[PDB]
Design a protein around this ligand. Structure first.
Ligand SMILES: [Mg+2]
Ligand SMILES: [Mg+2]
Ligand SMILES: [Mg+2]
Ligand SMILES: [Mg+2]
Ligand SMILES: [Mg+2]
Ligand SMILES: [Mg+2]
Ligand SMILES: [Mg+2]
Ligand SMILES: [Mg+2]
Ligand SMILES: [Mg+2]
Ligand SMILES: [Mg+2]
Ligand SMILES: [Mg+2]
Ligand SMILES: [Mg+2]
Ligand SMILES: [Mg+2]
Ligand SMILES: [Mg+2]
Ligand SMILES: [Mg+2]
Ligand SMILES: [Mg+2]
Ligand SMILES: [Mg+2]
Ligand SMILES: [Mg+2]
Ligand SMILES: [Mg+2]
Ligand SMILES: [Mg+2]
Ligand SMILES: [Mg+2]
Ligand SMILES: [Mg+2]
Ligand SMILES: [Mg+2]
Ligand SMILES: [Mg+2]
Ligand SMILES: [Mg+2]
Ligand SMILES: [Mg+2]
Ligand SMILES: [Mg+2]
Ligand SMILES: [Mg+2]
Ligand SMILES: [Mg+2]
Ligand SMILES: [Mg+2]
Ligand SMILES: [Mg+2]
Ligand SMILES: [Mg+2]
Lengths: 120, 48, 112, 43
RNA sequence: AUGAUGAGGUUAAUAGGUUCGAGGUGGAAGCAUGGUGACAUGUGGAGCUGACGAAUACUAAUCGAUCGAAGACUUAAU
RNA sequence: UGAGUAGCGAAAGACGGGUGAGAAUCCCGUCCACCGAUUGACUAAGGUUUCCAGAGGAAGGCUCGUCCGCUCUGGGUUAGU
RNA sequence: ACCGAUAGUGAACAGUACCGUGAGGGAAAGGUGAAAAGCACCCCGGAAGGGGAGUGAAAUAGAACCUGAAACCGUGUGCU
RNA sequence: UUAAGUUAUUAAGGGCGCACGGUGGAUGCCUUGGCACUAGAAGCCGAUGAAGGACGUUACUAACGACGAUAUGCUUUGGG
């Protein structure tokens, strides 16, 4: 695995903050090497959603943050309920994958290769 | 630690013969638009 | 004939602008625009702004066909420098040069 | 590290400044020399 | 170090994921029972598992572009 | 010339949305992290408009900059205790 | 039978910028054209800059404005 | 066809010569300022408030000059 230029405690925190906002917004834009690493983290988290029992509900809460979504029709759900509620429905037949990575050009301030990672 | 002689114009120019830059990948956007970079996504001025 | 366009007192240093400038000379104009949009040096949108200006002079001032034009010349000359200072250590200062450039490209249809 | 010239507004006007130069004869000499160069600020 | 080297580029197991294993840890959560309680027992060699092994085209290795020869003369055998 | 070399001055950021010719670096929001006998809050020396609004992006800012203690225009300090 | 902008007063535009707690020390910086007639208007560009056009005897006289050496930086090429 | 032999062709980049540009401000030409002297006058003011300065004064005001709440000046006598 990669180190991403951070310390062990910072890398873990940056990687689960990044995985949460991919559940909220379903496609985000970041660098190349960071998207290669959050690829495997978020798909192990949909596997927990497809099981659906209590013990894996407890295990996914190790990783996700506490974020409220202002859902449509003025409803509100947490990020954990949205994982076991909607994403677990769409991928009940597929056996892996669930994400893709699309490359773009460099940014201006760096030569950093931008990347869109989306949820499929 | 310090240079003993100056460097002439020839020896300076022989040194930077590899100090160059390369042309990029340059595929095409076949649907609509100008050239994009290879294995990338033709977002702006592009439909691929 | 030939058309030209220059851009005087550009704040980028002349060694840095001659690197990207060597990729485009001798090539026709449609390839040269495509190259300058895909190299990520800082100089690239400055040269590309100048090559747009020289193409527009050939269409308007001289009534050439812009579909078949080639870049004859492309070069960068030195401008006047700005002299700054930087304090180093133990009360000593050091000099710093802010270089400038004059960029010139000409474009032609190859006929007389 | 503490430097020299810790500035003070009372002290600067009292060891220097106009009335202190006028009170001695040698202080009047330095006012005469700065009027002769045409120096803009006196004391 | 970079670069080079080697394995692969859909007529595909290169990497990731998914499934099954090895090995490591050492008996999960929840529920029930006993006990005043701290706690213990059962469900159950349980559950979790980075780099290791095998299988599986689910995701991505797209479309494309560039370089690259056209067998000189003399003499002797044939 | 050395040379596109040394250096860019202690430290945790991520994403979304917006504005703009142009955004890692500006504004808004959520999460995360640091200090907390102090990176908090008052008052003196000292400095003298650096304060506020609007507009700007040549130089300054060790990068960028649509921003600024920078440039332009106009404003702002009220005592019988 | 003195100098002509590194000269001649330190000073042709200053005992000022600036340095110093202070006495005190102390610079750099001249020249469009006869006349401002100082580039209407069009085009590229966010602008800056530029190409045309026009003024003028002359704009490689366009305000960083007389002439414009050398170091130094570049682009093309004939022989190697 | 085979053997033996000789000689070519490349320029990633470099060197010499030539042509065209840029930076930079020498040289030439010039003078708005200075240096040294001659001749003739005159040399030092002030409690009737000096020398030298600070604040202000113009329709629009930053500095220099001039001026002082009669303030970017007032009266008179003579020139023009
Ligand atoms: Mg820790
Ligand atoms: Mg070279
Ligand atoms: Mg710049
Ligand atoms: Mg110091
Ligand atoms: Mg390097
Ligand atoms: Mg070295
Ligand atoms: Mg090194
Ligand atoms: Mg370094
Ligand atoms: Mg820093
Ligand atoms: Mg953002
Ligand atoms: Mg914020
Ligand atoms: Mg703490
Ligand atoms: Mg504070
Ligand atoms: Mg005070
Ligand atoms: Mg402010
Ligand atoms: Mg503002
Ligand atoms: Mg700026
Ligand atoms: Mg800057
Ligand atoms: Mg803007
Ligand atoms: Mg201000
Ligand atoms: Mg002089
Ligand atoms: Mg001269
Ligand atoms: Mg001072
Ligand atoms: Mg002098
Ligand atoms: Mg213009
Ligand atoms: Mg000439
Ligand atoms: Mg000049
Ligand atoms: Mg003349
Ligand atoms: Mg000239
Ligand atoms: Mg070459
Ligand atoms: Mg007398
Ligand atoms: Mg009269």
């Amino acid at each position: 695995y990669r180190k991403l230029g951070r310390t062990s405690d910072q890398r873990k925190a940056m990687l689960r903050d990044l995985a949460t906002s991919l559940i909220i917004s379903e496609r985000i834009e970041t660098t190349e090497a960071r998207a290669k690493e959050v690829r495997s983290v978020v798909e192990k988290l949909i596997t927990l959603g497809k099981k659906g029992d209590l013990a894996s509900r407890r295990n996914a809460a190790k990783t996700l943050r506490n974020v409220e979504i202002l859902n449509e029709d003025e409803t509100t759900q947490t990020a954990l309920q949205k994982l076991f509620g909607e994403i677990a429905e769409r991928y009940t037949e597929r056996q892996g994958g669930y994400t893709r990575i699309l490359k773009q050009g460099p940014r201006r301030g760096d030569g950093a290769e931008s990347v869109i990672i989306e949820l499929v | 630690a310090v240079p003993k002689r100056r460097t002439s114009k020839t020896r300076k120019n022989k040194r930077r013969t590899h100090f160059k830059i390369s042309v990029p990948g340059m595929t095409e956007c076949p649907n609509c638009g100008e050239y994009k970079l290879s294995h990338r996504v033709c977002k702006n001025c592009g439909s691929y | 004939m030939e058309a030209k366009a220059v851009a005087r007192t550009i704040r980028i240093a002349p060694r840095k602008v001659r690197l990207v400038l060597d990729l485009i000379r001798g090539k026709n104009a449609a390839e040269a625009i495509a190259i300058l949009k895909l190299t990520n040096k800082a100089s690239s949108p400055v040269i590309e702004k100048v090559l747009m200006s020289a193409l527009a002079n050939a269409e308007h001032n001289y009534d050439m066909n812009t579909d078949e034009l080639v870049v004859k010349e492309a070069y960068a000359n030195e401008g006047p420098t700005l002299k700054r200072f930087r304090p180093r250590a133990q009360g000593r200062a050091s000099a710093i040069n802010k270089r400038t450039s004059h960029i010139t490209i000409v474009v032609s249809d190859g006929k007389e | 590290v503490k430097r020299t010239y810790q500035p003070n507004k009372r002290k600067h006007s009292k060891v220097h400044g106009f009335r202190k130069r006028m009170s001695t004869k040698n202080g009047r000499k330095v006012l005469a020399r700065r009027r002769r160069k045409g120096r803009k600020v006196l004391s």
